[PDB]
Amino acid sequence: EKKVTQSLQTARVSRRKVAHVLWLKKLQDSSDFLQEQEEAARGVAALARA
Amino acid sequence: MNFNRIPTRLSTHYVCDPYTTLMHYRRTFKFLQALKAKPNCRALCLGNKNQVISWPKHFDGLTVVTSAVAAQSSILSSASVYYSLIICLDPVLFAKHLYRINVPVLGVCTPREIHEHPEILKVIDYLLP
Amino acid sequence: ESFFLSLCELEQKKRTERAIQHSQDLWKKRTAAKDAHSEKTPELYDGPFWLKFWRRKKRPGARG
Amino acid sequence: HSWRKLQLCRLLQRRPFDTGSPAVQLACLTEKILNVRAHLLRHFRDQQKKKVLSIWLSRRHRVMKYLYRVDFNLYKYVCQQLRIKCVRFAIPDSRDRQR
Amino acid sequence: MQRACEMVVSLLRVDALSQRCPFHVLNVQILDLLQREGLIRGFKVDGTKIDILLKHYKGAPVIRNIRVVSKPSRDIWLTPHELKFRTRFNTGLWIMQTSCGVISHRDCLRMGIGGKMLMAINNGYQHFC
Amino acid sequence: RLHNSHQARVLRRRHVYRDKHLDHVPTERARQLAEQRSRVKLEKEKFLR
Amino acid sequence: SHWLARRARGSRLATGRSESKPVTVVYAHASSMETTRPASSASLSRFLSNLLPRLFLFPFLSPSQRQSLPFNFVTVDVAAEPRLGAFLALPSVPALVCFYRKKLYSVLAPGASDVALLRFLKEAADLSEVCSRVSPENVAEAVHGARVAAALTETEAVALEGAWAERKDVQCLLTQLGVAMTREQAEEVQTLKNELVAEDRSEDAVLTGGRRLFAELQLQLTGDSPPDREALSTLLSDILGSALSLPESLQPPTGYAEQWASLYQIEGYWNELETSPVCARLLAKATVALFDHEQVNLQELDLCIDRASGEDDEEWPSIRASLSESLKTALNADEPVRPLDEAVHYAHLTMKNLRPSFFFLGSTAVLDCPLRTASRLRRLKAARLFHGGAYEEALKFAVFAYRLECQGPVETRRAAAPEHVLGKWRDEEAALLAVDSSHDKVGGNGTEDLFDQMACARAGWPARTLLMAMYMALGAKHPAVQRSRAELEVLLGTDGFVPVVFPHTRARAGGKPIMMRGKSGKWHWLGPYWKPPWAPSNKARWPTGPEEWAWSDPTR
Amino acid sequence: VRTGFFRTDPGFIDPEDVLFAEDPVRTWSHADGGGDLAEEVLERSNVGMGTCILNNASGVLNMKGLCGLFRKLRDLEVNPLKRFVVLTSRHRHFFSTGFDLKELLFLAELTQKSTEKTIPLVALWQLRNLCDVAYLVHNYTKPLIVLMNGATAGSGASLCCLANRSAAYHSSSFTCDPTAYGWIPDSGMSFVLANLRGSLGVFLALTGHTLSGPDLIWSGLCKHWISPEALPFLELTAEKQLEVSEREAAVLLEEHFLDAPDAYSLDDWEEVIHEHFDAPTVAEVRARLKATASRQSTSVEGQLHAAWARAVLDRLARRSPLAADVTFALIRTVQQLKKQIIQDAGIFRSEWHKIRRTGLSVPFTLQGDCRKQILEAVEDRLVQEALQLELRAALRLLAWSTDTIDGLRSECAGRLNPEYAYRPQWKFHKESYLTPLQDFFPRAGPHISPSCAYFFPTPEFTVTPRTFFPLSAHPLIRRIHPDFDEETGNDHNPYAMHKLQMQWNHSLFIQERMQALRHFRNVANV
């Protein structure tokens, strides 16, 4: 039965990380300076390639 | 309206439950019948002024201790000559005086009184809830 | 064929089925309770402290 | 520190979530002892952590004593992997500090 | 042995219908001896605890005294002719553990076997160690 | 069992593990489980008459 | 009746819609608030209307354009659909949400750049994938024309061209592969795995290695023919970072800081096996697949299982004589002794530190003992059924095979819980006298008996590991797994057990709180909130509980 | 009053009354030897009285329970410091289901597998133990208060109905339908049924009619009506039994008798039952019932009696004819013996009623005492005769009645599987069954196994004299004994007491039964 209990503990841990990933997603969206800087870096890369 | 502790546990009262009360009645009825079947026997009745004016405050049993050295002496010491049954209604008040009294005692009291002063069961012989 | 033995076997089989059902129900209940406990966030005890309980009154002197 | 303890656990664990088996307990206690020793080397004025370190040393000693009797081969393997002295408890210790 | 020396406390309760004690097979056997001797009304085994339903008579409890003889830090053994002298002229129960089980000192004396003296129940004032 | 010296403790061991959680002792939970495999409280009567 | 409305639990209008495409793009606007005033929502709607038909070439929008779009385009009004508004929870409007098969993926918020908008559209199209896309060179011209109709720079043209010319990305590929794996789409999983394995994507190895390995493993397992054990061995070794837990036959044949940092180095994908249930399930399924051979003949296996009983000494010689070479090889083949995720890096350690057994005297192989042969036949059939899909029969046969070894062959043929379980507190003389003759016979596995399994935690038992792997590969919540576990408990006769364990001591290290004497106010040990072990319960000490104005969640 | 509640208001629930509710079973939790509450019979240790509780898991009675109860009752009876005994059950829905139907089926198959069909020692031992326990229950020499606190199926109600203080209360069911599975009343059940007015007992045993509540009191099965709350009260208050004399204690026991409700289910049916069941034969009973059904009477009473007769015929058509005939013969024989005893004693109906009334209370007058003596003698004779006849009939049924086996099989199948309610398809001389059994002694029926000769040289039930005072190992305590013999110096016969101890022992019996079971299994091969 320990093995069956292990299959339960994996699900319990996985759902705990699912919540944290959502929290980071909110923090990323709130971050606009980071997003604009990354877009500017991508544009600079395209300019260098051209 | 209240600012005190709120108890969480309630204690039952087996001594004053329905069946126990019925048994009390059945057992006391036989003793009362046997006592009345005999002649020239008087029964004393004791209570409190606040639960009875007309009733006399002095009787033959009362001793009326007046000295400090006599404080420990009981006031119902001589009731045994005159009476063959003491019907008490204030066992808590009269406990020290009904202790080891040489006449049968029939006490009437409430479950709260019994539980708060269980020592009254050592001075009561018959109980009528 | 012994009807006594056949009845004993049938009794055992029915008892086995009932025990299986009861065990499965118990497992489901316990697993649900523990999953709910895990899902719930740690509760923070917000009541009074234990300064009165820090001290103990044990039997005094020897013999204690 | 938690990452390092997780790596040691994954090395010495019975199964994926085994964290209480005496081998994993020995690994985690060793890691905690090392972390507290580094912290003390930095904050040499933190006195309570020396007491905590002594307590954890005693706990690790008891865990090693238990594991030695319970599983000798695994005890040797754990000591080898952790690079710690493989103390043996075949007979009771001595009252001489030189021994 | 520790569990029995603990159960002494649970057995020596007064003004209680029943009391709990720690569980152990030795405790169960001593309780069997006590019930066969009619010193307790009964007992119940519930996991880590045993609930002893005590017996009373005229208010006072049947068990009036327990004297511990064999403690976990010191065994006490007796030959038959020493047990006879030590239990001389006493109506109390001296619990003995032997190769034949947990029995009374009277069974041990009739069997003439060497035993370990655990407890003395209602032995008054009679002890040597 | 009095003298639990080193030799006594070594000689007194039935098994590597003492799985106290695998012992069998009668229990009220066990009795209830047996009955369920196979409790209503009642109020006292009053005897008014 | 849009799925968005169904999820919102209502019938709110979705004017966009008046084989569903996998990706749905929701355009949330608030045109109802300002009908006479165009506001910014009207301008954005005009830009999108003049942009999408130009970006996507077809030889709000006309029906032809709506159909030709690679994604399902639906428009909603957050100011007129209260249910959808709460469902979307959009902080501001106008906005563009993207759902990948009824799952939120990305949200473009108001006031975004043209480059960001183009990247959003390109990503939606890629995830979704008569139909064509404008060339990245002409994307700038298309955007400029759309802007002119609704109403360029040197850097803007380059940015737009690069963004439109970029190919699929790691997030898109990983999400698609995960969904395909959960859907058991073999051809999809294959194509996506090949694209991920493509050399140009090797730069994303740190992010794609685990998913790639598990996709390979899932493809190998889901292949119609029984999985190839040799092929599975390589992937399993890669995933586990070692091969010491594999069966022997399948196993392939200086500075201070460096030495002290080598200790914390483990080379297995353990995060994924301890976090992702799909990965652990796949690992257990792979162990189950390894638990059987490939040359076994179906009819011969069935006949041998039917004839063999595990004890029949009058028929065992005929069975052994009639066994074929291939079946005998399969029976003698090595099989796992512990779960592949269990006992890694120390399975090589030797075990050293009983009574009569059901197994034949001097037995050392499967064929030596009749019981072991029947057990292995049942293990083979159970694994075959598990691979096929007959989970119920697979679990049944696996439990029967394990019980043949744990209990006696007669007690397993009974197919019922034991009549009496001896050894309890009270033993009845009826049971003691009916205990039969196979009473001292005890054991399992074949070399280590139950008395050895009890003593050693590293002992192996393939029959036990078969069931453990099946349970792990199906899941605890699986109805079949729950039924099988209940049946196992009942049949073994250990149901209804109530552990009785004493409490631990209330002695704790360090002592009790002490405040330093003098004028410092420092705690020599512990603080003023310390709860002594000899203290009542929290519920006892705080009868009222949380007040109505306390915070339900104490996290800051 | 308009919306608020009042105590006088009907339906007013008392919160304290609801809160203080208790589980009835938990009153006997502290009653065992080892404390695990697994023994068949649990004895509580109390001052001045004895308390025995039946604790079988299913409420069935087996040899282990028989032996335990026998030893406990004998010890309590001999003990003079225990002025009275109390008997109850720890079960939820049953007080006693009677002897084990599975055991009966096993004994029947064991008997009928043999070509000669000899009576096995296990069967004879079990039946003789049952008879001896029933006689002890009836003849106990102390106030024995036995409460039927639960349903009583089969023949398990005799242990209560035979006691000095048989008692009933609400939920005291009584379903004596032994003929449903081809079996007859036993353990004094026939005596109890025959001791009822008219043919009420015969009607009950034949129709399997269930009487519960005050029906027991009004029928006469149970003397008194006492609530279970008295039993703990008696345990706690039995210390004045030793402060008052024996007769005073016996009268003190009566304080716990209550007044039962006047309702009686069969109040307006005793005459009809007697008329239809006073016949000498079940064939005549069936004919009378059919005539009543076909009376073609449209009156109210006519239609009521026709419906009742149809119901009785339907309930009788599904039973075993042989079992019904044997039960009728046994009960009628006991009733006829009682009538003959009364007629030969020359006691009229009024005097007999006044004598019977002495059994419901302690007689305070000398004439009442003499009447009680007469009642004791009559009941002793009747119960001994009923036990002997029941033993004979049961032994012969075990050997010859295949309907017994089929009925037991069907009863077990129905008990296990609800849909297995299928009724067996069934296939008479009173003397053939009631004649004396043949024994071995240096008599027409089935032979008994030679092994029986050690314990029972005669398979005929007979009352074995018993001591009424404790046996000591000390010479003086032995000497003061009333059975003390100056010639030998011992207070008993050690040679006979050895056999008695062997007879009352479950280890020997269980070994014998397991060996018999193994031989029965080998009979499968041959």
PDB file of C-alpha atoms in Angstrom, chain H residues 31-96:
ATOM      1  CA  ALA H  31     -17.875  -7.916  31.879  1.00  0.00           C
ATOM      2  CA  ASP H  32     -15.299 -10.521  30.844  1.00  0.00           C
ATOM      3  CA  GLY H  33     -12.404 -12.623  32.056  1.00  0.00           C
ATOM      4  CA  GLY H  34      -9.703 -11.168  29.829  1.00  0.00           C
ATOM      5  CA  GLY H  35     -11.518  -7.898  29.204  1.00  0.00           C
ATOM      6  CA  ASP H  36     -11.924  -8.291  25.434  1.00  0.00           C
ATOM      7  CA  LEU H  37     -15.679  -9.035  25.683  1.00  0.00           C
ATOM      8  CA  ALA H  38     -15.339 -12.099  23.449  1.00  0.00           C
ATOM      9  CA  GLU H  39     -16.521 -14.867  25.793  1.00  0.00           C
ATOM     10  CA  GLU H  40     -19.880 -16.446  25.018  1.00  0.00           C
ATOM     11  CA  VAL H  41     -21.136 -15.778  28.565  1.00  0.00           C
ATOM     12  CA  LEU H  42     -19.908 -12.796  30.592  1.00  0.00           C
ATOM     13  CA  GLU H  43     -20.221 -12.710  34.383  1.00  0.00           C
ATOM     14  CA  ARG H  44     -20.057  -9.443  36.316  1.00  0.00           C
ATOM     15  CA  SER H  45     -18.764  -9.413  39.893  1.00  0.00           C
ATOM     16  CA  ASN H  46     -21.240  -7.683  42.212  1.00  0.00           C
ATOM     17  CA  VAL H  47     -21.953  -7.656  45.938  1.00  0.00           C
ATOM     18  CA  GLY H  48     -24.867  -9.817  47.044  1.00  0.00           C
ATOM     19  CA  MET H  49     -26.011 -10.917  43.586  1.00  0.00           C
ATOM     20  CA  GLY H  50     -24.916 -12.499  40.322  1.00  0.00           C
ATOM     21  CA  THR H  51     -25.120 -11.087  36.798  1.00  0.00           C
ATOM     22  CA  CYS H  52     -24.779 -13.202  33.648  1.00  0.00           C
ATOM     23  CA  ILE H  53     -24.921 -11.828  30.105  1.00  0.00           C
ATOM     24  CA  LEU H  54     -25.201 -13.815  26.881  1.00  0.00           C
ATOM     25  CA  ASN H  55     -22.574 -12.411  24.503  1.00  0.00           C
ATOM     26  CA  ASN H  56     -22.699 -14.613  21.408  1.00  0.00           C
ATOM     27  CA  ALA H  57     -22.034 -12.571  18.279  1.00  0.00           C
ATOM     28  CA  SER H  58     -25.183 -13.764  16.481  1.00  0.00           C
ATOM     29  CA  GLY H  59     -27.231 -14.434  19.619  1.00  0.00           C
ATOM     30  CA  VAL H  60     -27.032 -18.176  18.953  1.00  0.00           C
ATOM     31  CA  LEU H  61     -26.442 -20.703  21.735  1.00  0.00           C
ATOM     32  CA  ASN H  62     -23.738 -23.359  21.345  1.00  0.00           C
ATOM     33  CA  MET H  63     -21.899 -25.887  23.517  1.00  0.00           C
ATOM     34  CA  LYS H  64     -19.342 -23.314  24.680  1.00  0.00           C
ATOM     35  CA  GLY H  65     -22.115 -21.021  25.886  1.00  0.00           C
ATOM     36  CA  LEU H  66     -23.925 -23.983  27.431  1.00  0.00           C
ATOM     37  CA  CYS H  67     -20.876 -25.039  29.452  1.00  0.00           C
ATOM     38  CA  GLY H  68     -20.034 -21.494  30.524  1.00  0.00           C
ATOM     39  CA  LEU H  69     -23.596 -20.742  31.593  1.00  0.00           C
ATOM     40  CA  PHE H  70     -23.861 -24.077  33.403  1.00  0.00           C
ATOM     41  CA  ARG H  71     -20.696 -23.493  35.426  1.00  0.00           C
ATOM     42  CA  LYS H  72     -21.599 -19.878  36.202  1.00  0.00           C
ATOM     43  CA  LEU H  73     -25.144 -20.729  37.281  1.00  0.00           C
ATOM     44  CA  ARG H  74     -24.006 -23.649  39.438  1.00  0.00           C
ATOM     45  CA  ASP H  75     -21.398 -21.493  41.182  1.00  0.00           C
ATOM     46  CA  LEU H  76     -23.910 -18.693  41.769  1.00  0.00           C
ATOM     47  CA  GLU H  77     -26.594 -21.118  42.978  1.00  0.00           C
ATOM     48  CA  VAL H  78     -24.222 -22.741  45.454  1.00  0.00           C
ATOM     49  CA  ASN H  79     -22.907 -19.371  46.632  1.00  0.00           C
ATOM     50  CA  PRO H  80     -24.998 -18.252  49.647  1.00  0.00           C
ATOM     51  CA  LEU H  81     -23.563 -14.716  49.680  1.00  0.00           C
ATOM     52  CA  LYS H  82     -25.286 -14.157  46.306  1.00  0.00           C
ATOM     53  CA  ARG H  83     -28.952 -13.859  47.253  1.00  0.00           C
ATOM     54  CA  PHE H  84     -30.235 -13.725  43.664  1.00  0.00           C
ATOM     55  CA  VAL H  85     -29.139 -13.962  40.039  1.00  0.00           C
ATOM     56  CA  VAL H  86     -29.885 -11.882  36.945  1.00  0.00           C
ATOM     57  CA  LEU H  87     -29.747 -13.086  33.339  1.00  0.00           C
ATOM     58  CA  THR H  88     -29.673 -10.817  30.294  1.00  0.00           C
ATOM     59  CA  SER H  89     -28.162 -10.502  26.817  1.00  0.00           C
ATOM     60  CA  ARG H  90     -25.630  -8.067  25.366  1.00  0.00           C
ATOM     61  CA  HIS H  91     -26.958  -8.261  21.799  1.00  0.00           C
ATOM     62  CA  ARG H  92     -28.901  -5.574  19.925  1.00  0.00           C
ATOM     63  CA  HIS H  93     -31.871  -7.380  18.360  1.00  0.00           C
ATOM     64  CA  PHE H  94     -31.887 -10.775  20.129  1.00  0.00           C
ATOM     65  CA  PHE H  95     -32.053 -12.201  23.632  1.00  0.00           C
ATOM     66  CA  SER H  96     -31.592 -15.830  22.568  1.00  0.00           C
TER      67      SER H  96
END
